[PDB]
Enzyme design. Structure first.
Site, PDB file in Angstrom:
ATOM      1  N   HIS A   1      62.452   8.445   1.440  1.00  0.00           N
ATOM      2  CA  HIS A   1      62.809   8.679   0.036  1.00  0.00           C
ATOM      3  C   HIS A   1      61.628   9.156  -0.817  1.00  0.00           C
ATOM      4  CE1 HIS A   1      61.247   5.026  -1.827  1.00  0.00           C
ATOM      5  NE2 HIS A   1      61.769   4.306  -0.843  1.00  0.00           N
TER       6      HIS A   1
ATOM      7  N   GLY B   1      56.412   0.920  -6.547  1.00  0.00           N
ATOM      8  CA  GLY B   1      55.222   1.444  -5.881  1.00  0.00           C
ATOM      9  C   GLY B   1      54.905   0.738  -4.570  1.00  0.00           C
TER      10      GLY B   1
ATOM     11  N   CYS C   1      56.911   0.546  -1.973  1.00  0.00           N
ATOM     12  CA  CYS C   1      57.583   1.136  -0.809  1.00  0.00           C
ATOM     13  C   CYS C   1      56.594   1.621   0.217  1.00  0.00           C
ATOM     14  CB  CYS C   1      58.555   2.224  -1.227  1.00  0.00           C
ATOM     15  SG  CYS C   1      59.864   1.630  -2.324  1.00  0.00           S
TER      16      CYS C   1
END
Ligand SMILES: O=C(Cc1cccc(Cl)n1)Nc1cncc2ccccc12
Ligand SMILES: O=C(Cc1cccc(Cl)n1)Nc1cncc2ccccc12
Lengths: 305, 300
Positions: B41, B143, B145
């Protein structure tokens, strides 16, 4: 979202852990620059521990009596000296992995990460607090002596604890990296006990602010209190006194959540007098006191190292 | 003595964390050998998240659209491919700090350490369990991820989780390092919810054995139970069923403490009925389920 007991990343400390052997005893050492720090009791036999004269036991040792192993490499000991309850073994090689560091002595209530080690090899990392009774509720087995506690403030490792002993109640005692014990403990096999402990009030308040930030508000109420009235309640429930310094330190969390410190004290007072009534706060049925106000801000803001 | 929620030392993983940027999106990547793994993503804009066609979005990217930063050094991306929900960025430098590693897909109830990161920089380490509903109760902000979960039994890092998203209840969802999600989750902004969570029964039993090893016996009782009667009661408190596999797994702890597994199940049934009556077990007023039988043997 979420709130976990979080330790600092341990990598900078892992690169400093070494194995120190003296005769039959093997424990951990902290290798920083050209010095390996370890508990001075590494030189004792079980009989010596009953009433040790460390200067006399140490004068009988030569550099070659200390075997230091950094991974699978033997470091050569070229000097040895004692500073309080820590032995400093001068080695011929500076640790190339020595991080930016300082030695700091912490106060009760302050938290730190512990890198538990065995045979100079890190096994686990956990967070804990220096209790008001100067013990730490650690998790340590035989061979863990010399494991260290630390914090990271920016890019600097602040070493604050070195493990020395386990008390009969299963709690732990150690020193700062200058070898000064936290608490009224001595490195000797003699009757010693942890004193009656208390709850770290400012840390419970910080954790209640963390609960509010995370969407847990059931314990909030319309009431406020004074520092004097709250401190009467704190004394009654074996909570540490809350000072104006603690109130000031909680200022930022109070401003973010809109709950004044004394407003949060009135929530804590009600929780002490009435309990949780079957409810939980951040997945706990007990009031948690091992997160400082700084830990709460840091975790809830994502500070990196 | 003592029993703490203990994470593995994170150093081996810290040396793998990098920052991955694609356009305006910045998250974490895991740099192992010459490959950087990160959530796919990273290629999405805010408008792409409802029904992204990752193959179509990815085909439009070139290697120079991916900026990978390892400390203060920019790595050059020389290839890119998608494997399930993970993007694999081939880089022109092998990570000299690559530890001995493997990718393992874990089952619910398993525990692991999480090294939470922001902008490719480690922030903290904590211990998690894969919940029975395939979520993790992590601590992750925007942030985070690309932060990973792992175990380090015997010097080899077994990577088992990569963080992808936060669900509306504040719990987290992610994938294994092959990009397969744990649970029925998708890396889409569509309405998704965690299923009803249950307690990891085998882990609660392991933790009761840890309490007995550490000297506490107050919760023991003179009773035993059949496995089926235990499950009939435990399911009424939203506990996961205890299988014969779980009973076998608890064998070593049962042998060490001298308390038969079904005898410990009877203690658990009584704790569920009575609560703790103002007492604690290993410093907890709740029954802890994020220590596996393996964790207990490792720690005690
Ligand atoms: O307490 C000692 C040795 C000791 C005895 C007397 C005085 C001094 Cl300074 N040191 N070592 C240990 C440390 N932590 C945990 C342990 C668990 C089990 C057995 C020993 C453990
Ligand atoms: O969940 C996402 C991004 C995402 C991935 C896949 C699908 C969707 Cl719609 N969104 N990021 C976050 C992860 N963890 C924790 C967070 C906490 C706050 C804000 C974002 C967080």
């Amino acid at each position: 979202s979420g709130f976990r007991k979080m330790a600092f990343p341990s990598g900078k400390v892992e690169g400093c852990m070494v194995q120190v052997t003296c005769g039959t005893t093997t424990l951990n050492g902290l290798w920083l620059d050209d010095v390996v720090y370890c508990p001075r009791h590494v030189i004792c036999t079980s009989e010596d521990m009953l009433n040790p004269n460390y200067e006399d036991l140490l004068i009988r040792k030569s550099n070659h009596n200390f075997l230091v192993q950094a991974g699978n490499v033997q470091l050569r000991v070229i000097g040895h000296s004692m500073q309080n309850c820590v032995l400093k073994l001068k080695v011929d090689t500076a640790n190339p992995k020595t991080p930016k560091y300082k030695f700091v002595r912490i106060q009760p209530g302050q938290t730190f990460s512990v890198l538990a080690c065995y045979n100079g090899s890190p096994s686990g990392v956990y967070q804990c607090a220096m209790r008001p009774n100067f013990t730490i509720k650690g998790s340590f087995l035989n061979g863990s002596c010399g494991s260290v506690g630390f914090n990271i403030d920016y890019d600097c490792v602040s070493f604050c604890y070195m493990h020395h002993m386990e008390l009969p109640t299963g709690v732990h005692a150690g020193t700062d990296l200058e070898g000064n014990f936290y608490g009224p403990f001595v490195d000797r096999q003699t009757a010693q006990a942890a004193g009656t402990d208390t709850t770290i009030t400012v840390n419970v308040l910080a954790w209640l602010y963390a609960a509010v930030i995370n969407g847990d508000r059931w314990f909030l109420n319309r009431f406020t209190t004074t520092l004097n009235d709250f401190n009467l309640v704190a004394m009654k429930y074996n909570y540490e006194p809350l000072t104006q310094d603690h109130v000031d330190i909680l200022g930022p969390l109070s401003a973010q959540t809109g709950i004044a410190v004394l407003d949060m004290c009135a929530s804590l007072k009600e929780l002490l007098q009435n309990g949780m009534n079957g409810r939980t706060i951040l997945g706990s049925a007990l009031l948690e006191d091992e997160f400082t106000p700084f830990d709460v801000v840091r975790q809830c803001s994502g500070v990196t190292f």
